[PDB]
Design a protein around this ligand. Structure first.
Ligand code: O3V
Ligand code: O3V
Ligand code: O3V
Ligand code: MG
Ligand code: MG
Lengths: 335, 337, 339
């Protein structure tokens, strides 16, 4: 719990109402009860703010006239919401202290206040920084290093020789450092290319659940600082992702792709490899990226949904578009 | 477990034609069935082939009966009868039996009657496991989560904190329920984490495949209705709502705050945008690119399917330049008129 | 790990030019290579750059040799030689060594010689592990499953019951082999589970990436042939059959009862529908949408690639209205034909 006056101070918001109100948590506008602080971004929710039963509402100045409760005025309600939710976070830690069922190699190097959950497995030579938390059931492979403040939820797999920076967060089911998909071909038989590169993850990286990030073949797969990656993504060997880029759910990236800084890769996109995407590119969901992207801006692909009866005709016509083109050229020639 | 044919026929509400004392030991395909096996025929084209099936009994319709070359179980719906008899004769093991000494179970967890927990599973404080719940080896169940009676998790399932799972659910290995939704605010180009303090509510009789991820909500909850079936490798984002009885095939990727109605069918590898609604009784065919709300029931499709590469090159180049083609058509139309 | 250059050259069937007594400690990229490293050159545009490479030896072709600024191993196939020398000098650790005290192993399991089982792995009753099999930490191997000699599972792999895996396979972490196929009957709108009592049969020398799922069959079996390579995040549905030496890149989804032949190459993020067959020696390029059987070898493709969003908006609008474009074209043809 926190006093509304103290919360507004920490949030650099200006308070309009009883600063002695006690805030115990954050809630949506529709669910907020007494003690909750909430927020609004869309002006449509103005007309019925009197129906919201939160103790306080984070809003802008243009919103204040419509307020029907204590209000914290800020320039950016959504960012203030992020900050106040961190202050009022109820999320537990993946582990507390080192569990007696954890299996930790005697050559592991552990900092202070490291927590390791039940049945986690820590291999030889692993370095865990101060305040690192390893969840139940994780595996951390030989000589990997995890920087101070980083946290793995339950059942994360880190392979060997992996480097992870400070204050990262990796959700369950994710695998960092599996072999890249590298094979030579000897007369039709695949010949494995050992993948002896690594994965380097920077600081403040968040990776979702059941995402896979392969190690490089010789040099490294690199995730920049401040990158956020959603669930179900595949980051192939020797991919390089620039700082602060965001990758939404289910994105598949091929080997040796380079993505710049401040990019936004939409859900379920497919990005081919051995090419570069420049800074400040947005690919919208399901984008089929076949060529380098050299200019910033928003890019898209795909023919959207239609009723099935309509789609049948659309697809058949598109598949015969060469014949349509030939007929147009012939008609131009004749006219 | 072996069963007399007459008893199996009674449990299936089938009409027995043949020796009720035949002992059935399992279910098999028509081509693999041997003595002791029961099988089924759904396709009357195989009537002439039944003499090649070595099953001790065959489930079939009344129209099929004159063609039988074995004891027959006559039913109205051979396919449904097959599902029922396979359940009766199921050889699938349980994920665990009893409580393994290597499992780590917080003292405050509440176990119902006849709960089984497999080797090296981890059960956090405040967890409640209903009667007959089975947790597979190596699972994690997070703080205060509740799993209803008869639900079963295979090995290596991850349930986060404050998750509610109904009765008689089944969750395959590698699945993660309740990870953080993809919630971040942007501050001058830096991403600022939004704690995801909502939950996941999973209803009764829900089946979830392997390596599927269902994220918790930001403030309110991600909700999966009763009787929903979800295949492998699906992504259900934070604050998605999936209505009762909907089926989601493999590899479907859903964005945040999507609401899918009841009785929908979402084909494999579809991609569904967020902050929008799909009404009841909608079918999206495979690889559907769902970018806008769907407000009428029925069948919807997208995608330009495969062609020989030489042909595809022309299709793709012409589509990409279709604006020029459209302009040329208009210009030719004006010249002719 | 260290090996004299002359000995390495002999094991590679390479021709040594330079000091055979050089001690090679590992493999590196041309850009990263330092003393003790061996590297390779596949692209002759780097001949002028070899003086910037500080490897102790470089694998190259006879045509490259005049450009060398180091000991050289001359071979016909630098890329294949690299694969072989990377295997000889492999630094990849094993998933486990010996049998960990924290592993839980059913008394009825049968182990071959020199089996290793990692910490907190769980082995069910009736499992058979062949000689030199390695089971990583935290794995689960379900009842009666059999893993052939030399096969290795990395950490946190799940093998269900009644699964058969061949020799010298390799499965990366997070993968699930033998989960229930997506099988349901329907009773008045209620899904009725169909127990999936078939199996998965995986052949010899199969490599499977991370977080891939391969479901068991409904009655008969899901089958992966010998020498198949499957990348990460793939989905192989119940009763799929994949022929020998086929490669499947990352994120491919295959629906039930698909049959893929031998020597196929399935590009990343492709979607392959089921109850159909793809013949031998078919290449599906990335993101391919396969709706019909493929009966002739060769290369097949689908998809409309990326455009700037403002351009894409117009493209999508025109395509969605392509039927009207077709009707206008036919009408203009009748006019030009004087009808
Ligand atoms: C990173 C952020 C804070 C902001 C953001 O821009 C974003 C976010 N979540 C998304 N989910 N999906 C998605 C998921 C599944 C299917 C389809 C789409 C996107 O495409 C998402 C995007 C993007 C839009 C355009 C480029 S990235 C949250
Ligand atoms: C649930 C059910 C008993 C019936 C059903 O409706 C269904 C089933 N299995 C499927 N597999 N795939 C699939 C998987 C991967 C790639 C491509 C396709 C579908 O699209 C499937 C569908 C659906 C078709 C259209 C909408 S849902 C079995
Ligand atoms: C097996 C091999 C040594 C050779 C090979 O053929 C191949 C390889 N890696 C790939 N990655 N991706 C990919 C991954 C993610 C997104 C987009 C593309 C492909 O499509 C790949 C392919 C293929 C190309 C065409 C058919 S298979 C490595
Ligand atoms: Mg243990
Ligand atoms: Mg996908």
């Amino acid at each position: 719990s926190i006093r509304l006056a103290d919360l507004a101070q920490q949030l650099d918001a200006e308070l309009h109402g009883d600063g002695d109100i006690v805030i115990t948590g954050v809630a949506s506008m529709q669910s907020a009860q007494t003690g909750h602080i909430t927020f609004m971004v869309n002006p449509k929710y103005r007309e019925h703010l009197g129906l919201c039963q939160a103790s306080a509402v984070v809003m802008t100045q243009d919103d204040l006239p419509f307020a029907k409760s204590a209000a914290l005025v800020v320039k950016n309600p959504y960012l203030t919401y992020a900050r106040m939710a961190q202050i009022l976070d109820t999320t537990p830690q993946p582990a507390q202290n080192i569990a007696p069922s954890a299996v930790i190699d005697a050559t592991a190097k552990l900092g202070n206040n490291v927590s390791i959950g039940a049945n986690a497995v820590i291999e030889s030579g692993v370095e865990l920084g101060d305040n690192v938390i390893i969840g139940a059931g994780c595996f951390v492979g030989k000589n990997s290093k995890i920087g101070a403040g980083s946290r793995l939820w339950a059942n994360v797999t880190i392979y060997h020789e992996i480097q992870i920076g400070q204050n990262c967060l990796i959700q369950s089911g994710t695998v960092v450092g599996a072999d890249g998909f590298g094979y030579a071909n000897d007369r039709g038989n695949w010949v494995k290319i050992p993948q002896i590169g690594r994965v380097i993850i920077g600081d403040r990286v968040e990776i979702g659940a059941c995402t896979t990030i392969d190690r490089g073949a010789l040099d490294d797969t690199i995730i920049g600082n401040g990158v956020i990656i959603d669930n179900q993504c595949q980051i192939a060997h020797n991919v390089v992702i620039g700082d602060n880029t965001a990758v939404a759910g289910g994105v598949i990236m091929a080997g040796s792709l380079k993505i710049g800084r401040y990019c936004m890769i939409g859900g379920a996109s497919v990005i081919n490899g051995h090419m570069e995407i420049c800074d400040k590119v947005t690919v919208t969901g399901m984008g089929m990226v076949m060529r380098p992207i050299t200019e910033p801006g928003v890019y898209s692909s795909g023919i959207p949904l239609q009723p099935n009866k309509v789609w049948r005709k659309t697809a058949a016509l598109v598949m015969n578009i060469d014949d349509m083109s030939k007929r147009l050229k012939s008609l131009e020639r004749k006219v």
